[PDB]
Design a protein around this ligand. Structure first.
Ligand SMILES: *[C@@H]1O[C@H](CO)[C@@H](O[C@@H]2O[C@H](CO)[C@@H](O[C@@H]3O[C@H](CO[C@H]4O[C@H](CO)[C@@H](O)[C@H](O)[C@@H]4O)[C@@H](O)[C@H](O[C@H]4O[C@H](CO)[C@@H](O)[C@H](O)[C@@H]4O)[C@@H]3O)[C@H](O)[C@H]2NC(C)=O)[C@H](O)[C@H]1NC(C)=O
Ligand SMILES: *[C@@H]1O[C@H](CO)[C@@H](O[C@@H]2O[C@H](CO)[C@@H](O[C@@H]3O[C@H](CO[C@H]4O[C@H](CO)[C@@H](O)[C@H](O)[C@@H]4O)[C@@H](O)[C@H](O[C@H]4O[C@H](CO)[C@@H](O)[C@H](O)[C@@H]4O)[C@@H]3O)[C@H](O)[C@H]2NC(C)=O)[C@H](O)[C@H]1NC(C)=O
Ligand SMILES: *[C@@H]1O[C@H](CO)[C@@H](O[C@@H]2O[C@H](CO)[C@@H](O[C@@H]3O[C@H](CO[C@H]4O[C@H](CO)[C@@H](O)[C@H](O)[C@@H]4O)[C@@H](O)[C@H](O[C@H]4O[C@H](CO)[C@@H](O)[C@H](O)[C@@H]4O)[C@@H]3O)[C@H](O)[C@H]2NC(C)=O)[C@H](O)[C@H]1NC(C)=O
Lengths: 246, 246, 246
């Protein structure tokens, strides 16, 4: 249920087990988070995972996390982006294990996004368990229950609203899993590979079963994908920028 | 219901149609967001909207949005600040159209602010529809109903509490509409032009009718303005820093 | 109920009255917030609070608050860290008085953190008044009522869950009171000085009685400290990095 870094370097096209949360790391002690990127590049070079030519791209990772994620997602090539992300996860080795529960430094951005904005359907049907889970941290264990089909019926003749709400869920997921995960989601979206997209998000939910809000947003994405609005769904255009170069 | 940039340059004093959200833009395709500020300054110069002397102030806009907004609001002169804001809206051409609905990258800051803090009246009367709309995204369509006059009575003999809660609403609005919009609000506040202030916020609510939380905060500001506490209202002093130089 | 800066410089070990919120300041007018750090270092030097050798560490405080807090907490020595924090509070003289009520620029971070994440106990018992206060700003005046002992019973055989939820409360407090306050909390935690820790947080709650969410999180920390899970409590390891050098 994970991918090795060198094995991932051998593969030609991005796949689920070569995205951030599924990369096999190790420990993760206090010391490694202190390590600067020069040391991590030197480690990767000494193991012959990378060559000298690849050391600068690692040493140019900005020291702050927000800048590091922008730097990673700027890359247009699968193996380069993967190498950078792996260096960063070698410094912040708990970046994605933090997603196992309901808090942590790397979760704040996506949670802040999801809870600060509003779904169109939740504004009209705030008693739905999905909405109560997003807004109040309430009823999360039954979040995937569409009471009286209100949500489904609500979206029925409302392509634009379906598009807004599903894009808000996917934008939250983008903020959760920046970098290779988002390049993979972008790839599937651009090809309308809806079944593969749900397969990947379901793998994320299986990876982090202790993360209640994440489970709710993933179930919601699968629900929207089952609705008639999906056939004409128009994803937000920022995704096209996250695609890799031909 | 909007202002043209050059026409705005001709006018002597800031007015509603020469603030950010009311500046007439066009499209707004994928390409223009990629354009650096040197290109946008060159465009404005080629149209003779600005001269060579004005090119550096545009090319000095920092690349990140937070820095660009700080840069804009640092300006002490109406036409300079307007020109900078217009260059930025020429790059992020959807910055203010994002406010048409209930999400988007440019809305996060103000929504995070409004929902992370608390109104004094809502702590004591959390069942008020305004409070349920701010906190739970619930009852937003009846947010401007003061049940049993609880809010009004609550503020009656409480000048300090009225001041805190109205300032929290206005600070959220400041975070929504930085730059020229905030210089305009600052101008009206410093002159106690309460009717003009409400006229402007009501124009914002009319511009963005699909934005439920924004509608609620704007209705709330008009309600507070109708209360006896408004006559002695003391706005937060940061506003005085956003005024233009004499 | 506060500490003087020079008197604090005389003392050998960090104590409650030499942490940020308890440092005695004065006014705090509009002008002082405009003052750059060179001027503040010159003031402190002219009063002979510091010497010329200490001027650079003050002039190197980055201009943005987030960077200033990172700079302060990087210091490994009590008197240095205190001096830096005092310079910063001399510029943003309302940084900690902002905590007297339910909003303000310096409160956003910790409130955003506390409300974006979730307590394990609140996911299962969302009707608890503590959970309603954190999530909905509701029932804050009775937040410290554990209805039917649900919370206590919930943690009874769940050391890991107790650890997660108490660490989330303490991490929120860390985000509220960065710098010397966090070095003091780190010191008490590393020595399992649970009674002193509660004494300090209770002083914070007494300092800011108008801050409803802060009162709730402080009462909650004292409640957890009373439970059998405290004896084997394992604090998050970032705290050990905030300790001062021997
Ligand atoms: C990320 O995760 C994916 C799965 O999600 C992994 O892909 C699997 O990789 C394994 C190992 O290479 C594959 O198993 C091998 O398949 C060979 C046939 O492949 C073709 O046919 C299958 C359908 O039958 C297609 O799915 C596939 O795309 C090809 O078209 C077999 O010949 C192999 O059998 C031989 O080796 C095994 C193992 O030693 C022996 O037990 C056998 O007896 C035999 O000698 C083998 O079964 C598997 O097919 C792949 N699945 C998919 C869906 O593609 C990636 O490897 C993984 N990446 C990383 C970096 O970890
Ligand atoms: C931003 O939005 C404001 C409104 O909110 C616009 O201001 C209006 O601008 C129009 C066009 O210039 C003004 O209309 C003209 O008013 C002239 C008289 O102005 C004085 O009197 C009025 C009261 O009657 C005052 O409000 C005003 O301040 C002045 O004191 C008329 O003489 C004009 O009539 C002539 O031109 C029109 C149009 O071609 C013809 O149809 C007429 O027959 C006649 O020949 C004209 O009506 C309007 O008064 C302004 N309103 C206000 C409230 O000031 C800004 O122009 C706009 N800015 C930008 C950059 O878009
Ligand atoms: C931060 O806050 C702490 C308290 O939380 C202050 O610590 C107190 O400081 C005062 C003033 O120095 C101390 O009062 C003095 O205590 C002396 C005895 O101290 C020993 O014994 C006590 C127990 O009795 C211990 O707590 C202490 O640690 C020592 O082991 C007395 O001899 C003093 O009395 C003399 O002076 C007073 C005042 O002028 C006269 O009225 C007396 O008659 C007598 O002449 C005095 O009482 C107090 O003990 C300290 N408390 C604690 C708990 O340590 C810090 O000073 C303060 N720091 C800053 C920078 O503000």
């Amino acid at each position: 249920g994970g991918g090795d870094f060198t094995t991932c370097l051998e593969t030609e096209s991005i796949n689920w087990n070569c995205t951030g949360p599924f990369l096999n790391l190790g420990n993760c002690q206090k010391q490694q988070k202190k390590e600067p990127y020069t040391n991590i590049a030197t480690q990767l070079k000494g193991l012959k995972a990378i060559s000298v030519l690849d050391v600068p791209i690692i040493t140019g990772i900005p020291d702050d996390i927000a800048g590091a994620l922008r730097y990673i997602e700027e890359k247009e090539d699968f193996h380069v982006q993967l190498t950078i992300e792996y260096a960063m996860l070698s410094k912040y080795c708990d970046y994605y294990t933090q997603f196992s529960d309901n808090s942590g430094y790397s979760q704040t951005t996506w949670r802040v996004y999801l809870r600060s904005h509003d779904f169109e359907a939740c504004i009209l049907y705030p008693n739905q368990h999905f909405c109560r889970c997003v807004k109040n941290g309430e009823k999360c264990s039954s979040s995937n229950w569409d009471f009286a089909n209100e949500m489904k019926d609500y979206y029925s003749g409302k392509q634009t609203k379906f598009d807004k709400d599903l894009n808000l869920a996917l934008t939250a997921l983008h903020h959760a899993f920046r970098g290779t995960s988002s390049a993979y989601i972008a790839t599937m979206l651009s090809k309308k590979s809806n079944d593969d997209l749900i397969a990947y998000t379901n793998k994320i939910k299986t990876k982090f079963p202790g993360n209640a809000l994440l489970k709710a947003i993933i179930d919601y994405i699968a629900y929207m994908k089952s609705l008639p609005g999906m056939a004409n769904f128009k994803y937000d255009e920022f995704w096209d920028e996250l695609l890799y170069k031909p």
